[PDB]
Symmetry: D2
Subunit: 344 residues, 4 copies
Amino acid sequence: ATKVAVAGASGYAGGEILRLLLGHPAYADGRLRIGALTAATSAGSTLGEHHPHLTPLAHRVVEPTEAAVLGGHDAVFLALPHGHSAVLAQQLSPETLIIDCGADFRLTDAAVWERFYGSSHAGSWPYGLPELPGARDQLRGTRRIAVPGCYPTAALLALFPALAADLIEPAVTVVAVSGTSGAGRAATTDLLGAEVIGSARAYNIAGVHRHTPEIAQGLRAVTDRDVSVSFTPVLIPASRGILATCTARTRSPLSQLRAAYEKAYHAEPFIYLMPEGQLPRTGAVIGSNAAHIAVAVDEDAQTFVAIAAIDNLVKGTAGAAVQSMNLALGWPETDGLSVVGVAP
Amino acid sequence: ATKVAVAGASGYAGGEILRLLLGHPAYADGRLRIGALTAATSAGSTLGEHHPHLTPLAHRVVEPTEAAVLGGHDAVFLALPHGHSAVLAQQLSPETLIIDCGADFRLTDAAVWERFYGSSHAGSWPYGLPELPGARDQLRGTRRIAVPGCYPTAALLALFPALAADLIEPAVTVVAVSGTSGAGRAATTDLLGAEVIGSARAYNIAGVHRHTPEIAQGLRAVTDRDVSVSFTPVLIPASRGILATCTARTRSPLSQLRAAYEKAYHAEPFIYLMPEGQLPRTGAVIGSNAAHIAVAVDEDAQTFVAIAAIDNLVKGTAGAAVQSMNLALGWPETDGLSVVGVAP
Amino acid sequence: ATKVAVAGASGYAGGEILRLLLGHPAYADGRLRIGALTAATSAGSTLGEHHPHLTPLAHRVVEPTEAAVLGGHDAVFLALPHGHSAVLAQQLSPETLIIDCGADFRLTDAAVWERFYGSSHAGSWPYGLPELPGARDQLRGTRRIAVPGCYPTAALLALFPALAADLIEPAVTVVAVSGTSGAGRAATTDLLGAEVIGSARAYNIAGVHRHTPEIAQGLRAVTDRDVSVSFTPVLIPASRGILATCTARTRSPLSQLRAAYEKAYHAEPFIYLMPEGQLPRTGAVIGSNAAHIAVAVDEDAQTFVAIAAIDNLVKGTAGAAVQSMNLALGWPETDGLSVVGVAP
Amino acid sequence: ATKVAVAGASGYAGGEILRLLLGHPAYADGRLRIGALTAATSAGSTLGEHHPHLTPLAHRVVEPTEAAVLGGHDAVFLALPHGHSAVLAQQLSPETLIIDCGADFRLTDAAVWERFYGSSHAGSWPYGLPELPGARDQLRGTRRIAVPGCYPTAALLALFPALAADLIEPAVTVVAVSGTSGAGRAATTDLLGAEVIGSARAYNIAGVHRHTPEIAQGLRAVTDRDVSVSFTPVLIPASRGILATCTARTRSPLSQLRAAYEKAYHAEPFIYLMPEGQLPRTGAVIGSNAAHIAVAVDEDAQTFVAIAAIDNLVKGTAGAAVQSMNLALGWPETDGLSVVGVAP
Ligand SMILES: O=C(O)C1c2ccccc2Oc2ccccc21
Ligand SMILES: O=C(O)C1c2ccccc2Oc2ccccc21
Ligand SMILES: O=C(O)C1c2ccccc2Oc2ccccc21
Ligand SMILES: O=C(O)C1c2ccccc2Oc2ccccc21
């Protein structure tokens, strides 16, 4: 049996991990058990006060996020996508399966880390994006998982097959729209409903967003050419969803680009290549662990266009974490993870 | 095995029935098969062109809605919440399980039917709201189910325990907000995104809405008093969800009303009574078959207040249909029906 | 000339007052001048950092909210709809025209005030709802204005003509949906976009909302019958707008009720009575100072239904303040206040 | 006095033209009169049945769109952004001021027109984007105006100063999010509220969108180089607003690019260059004729980034039409056109 703790249970990523665990077949047959649920504030409150959608766990008392509380759990989700978990991870029993939703163990270049995060690089753990070349093998039986960022998940799935096949130039452009749950649950004026509803805005533009080097790192793993990444995130008035529009120069026939996506994804159950003449929409993947992808060539502009839609909280965060957890535990990789969206 | 057809498969209710069937344990172990998917238009198209979220069924070819196509199935969902199924249903065998999402077999008073629907009364089938007193008995082993309207589902769950215990007056007021998927998929200018987004409006007010007599009928069934119903629906800029605010005069203490709701709902798997101090929200029930209910007493106004939140497409439509299906077939009532919402 | 200060300039009400002042004909011809803009935090920031829509004032430096900063202004808007301005108002020069967006000077019953607000009653100032009987005369040349709450504005406009004519019973029910800007700009988890989008919820139900006695007070001014108010507010995923559904028992002919609304509003430029067969929508009044009102009778339920739509930030807050300011200064009452909404 | 007709009055662009005319100073002092309001359907209905926000015109009777009805007016708005006005415009006098919101007279290359629109090229009229180099000269005293498309307006304001100064490469990438009112009022299933709310999707990708050659044409006019345009539009769940993210390779320093934008826009009343450290948002420009623009350089990616926010219905359509009208008639260009957004 695997007893699971969720640190940061009261945030959006933590609530979504718990939603997926409650629906997981190992929860139903007793193999997966939900233990301590912790938060940095509001210890002593009940979970229902934070996540009224999780009624089977409503009565659970939130505990402080402390190593002692997290002891005795075979797996610990560090559900702080915008936090720094290196210090807490060091405090846990090292045989624990530690699944970090944050960034501390994602990057593999210490100088890049220090430039973008302002601290000493902690190192890296197996990246929880099983569809990326070579990634699945590193996750089988791992006791450490670095969950990818939500935007890099969409951009890498959209772009890596074309670049791996050397069919596009290695200077890529990504403009990705995101619902606001990706910002997490910390209350700020700029994330208030009145501000977000009816409005769209780019933010952290022109290379300052910390997911820029994460996209570059994933792409550099499938090519030896010099990769550059122009990444612009755009907040839109939705709660969930990322639609990444990804471009690069190309002079390759569309059919050869489509063949590269076929080769990458034909046997990947969470990656859906759109039928000819269809394009992804985030509405179709909400609540699912799926990515819907379409590709095209703008011949006049000599530009490849790849569109990818994911649910930022599922395939971009908690679904990635659970998918990687399945691989870590030797369980069927698709367990608990639907490809069917909740639409409209 | 139970071979199931879905007529009206390309509409919202039909797509949500299919989502639930795809996740149903009887589909997973082969006891339930998804057969013919039909529509009144676009026969020959594929389901993926209508429901991109249902990728496991994307290649299914939509067939014409005809009694011949629907014969040879053990169960038939008539997934036309705004259609009139009487003529088609009369062509199907009494032994075929028919689950009608439309209104034709909901009402038990022919004169009321004629007044509000302007046609001859087709009859009455067991009402697919298993939590109503006596309803579960009528559904077990039925081959006929009339699924309730979405607004009546919310209003009846909010009000029937108080009224059945004679703890409120039988003159009730319901003001219910709803997302736009309740209107179905028929394109009209009043339901365009640009019109609906950022706007709220009441419609079909002051007793002309056809769900008014349906609420009255369900409430009359739990009391011996003349029931009157003031029902105002309000369209809001959401795709799913109904939040029903329901009021009635009372002279009874809150403690007695609370006890009546506990007694009615403590063992009901889909009905969640909010802990004291918490109130329902539609976000918490989206994608689930749950209803979240809270009750209160306005002492100064001598008024009972009951709030109910449901997903209009699940507990208000397709989830009720599948729940009643489970009962009709002798399967565990909760099969395929989660109480956990997809939030935020 | 009238030099105007706005205290609380960085909140939503303060930003909307400034929007209306910038468009006011007295600003254009030099008679109205915009002076100090203050806030409790962020003094030294520029206004553009808080209200990027107010580009003509973007460079203004926010000053601390202090009596000394507000001196030398002929009119001071206390744009703190959820604050308590009695202490600051006492510090201003008493000949100043003081326009309080908060509640401290709205209520006329000290015991009611203490019950709902937990403090000693400060008194009352002329209520800034000029269409209410007797209200306009108290605002002409006043140096004090208590701006109404947003929900009472909608409910009182919907209900007072029927009650004044004694055509409905004095026990009224109000269920009002509101966009989230009415909560103000203080960051809380429950007002975050991810939480608000796609969700609706009632709050402060069963008589605990402080606008309940404000509605009762306005209605008691048009009748000597004992008034009771059941008031339920519902948050919906819009930034602006209140749609109030208001009911009461009646046995009066609809035509007599319509005549009462005609008598009240035929000469009121901001009150639009819907043509027969039309119903209000908040989308149609956004950005305008208008209220759109329809009335009906549910004969089966013996219930009067009145629907009122306003923009909560204009007719429900800042437009009420500017309308009352015009009356205070002896300026045309409609100056700077459009009846045309910004739709879709 | 200038008697104005609006053909297509019942659509979104027509309603927004009428909103602006109602607030125009020439309407207030009688120099502009609103004459015939026409549509291709529902002649005989009243305007209030189409545009409930335009209550001062609610009683106007919609007339058939015919050259006879439109004659006898000094100015005619053809408010059909997706219509083809060539045949109707050829029936009107050269001395009548015609302002076409549609595309028929925008393009200057007949072969490009035939390729993208599949019809004979009707000709070219002065392009209604007064801020483009040389455009104001062409509009003064014209009797013919082709209003720009909404996406080209945003992309050209974002990009032309950099390209005209030869500070970026002439291969540009535009990814622009838009609210749904840009689609007009024609009811289709893909534009239903339930579909659009909570979803984002790219459409008409990889060079098939008809605004691609329009962007290319406007950019070609400021440079001597071959221009290529990769343009991806993305529909988001808002009613109004376009946020264009525009990129191009560059070797020029940020200081030089910033200076070029200051030089181009410092005296342009509707173009607001964001203070350093601020970025545009569509919420800040809704209901205004303003464009908010920020520029940046991604040094690692050697990429220039320009962000532009407009209201698609004002600066992208009806505001551009009225602005160009003012120029054609010799009225102050800013008459009736505020730069202040209606936010939140
Ligand atoms: O961009 C990010 O890294 C992340 C985010 C992700 C998706 C959408 C919005 C969003 O905003 C914030 C705000 C604070 C901290 C992190 C984020
Ligand atoms: O009210 C209804 O009966 C139903 C509906 C339900 C929820 C939300 C909107 C809505 O609108 C329409 C429109 C056409 C036909 C039926 C409906
Ligand atoms: O209800 C209110 O009095 C007011 C409010 C008005 C409209 C919409 C939401 C809303 O929520 C809050 C939250 C905090 C303080 C005041 C409010
Ligand atoms: O893209 C366009 O040309 C235009 C449009 C503009 C903004 C947003 C959506 C939108 O969709 C449609 C649909 C039909 C016809 C034109 C459009």
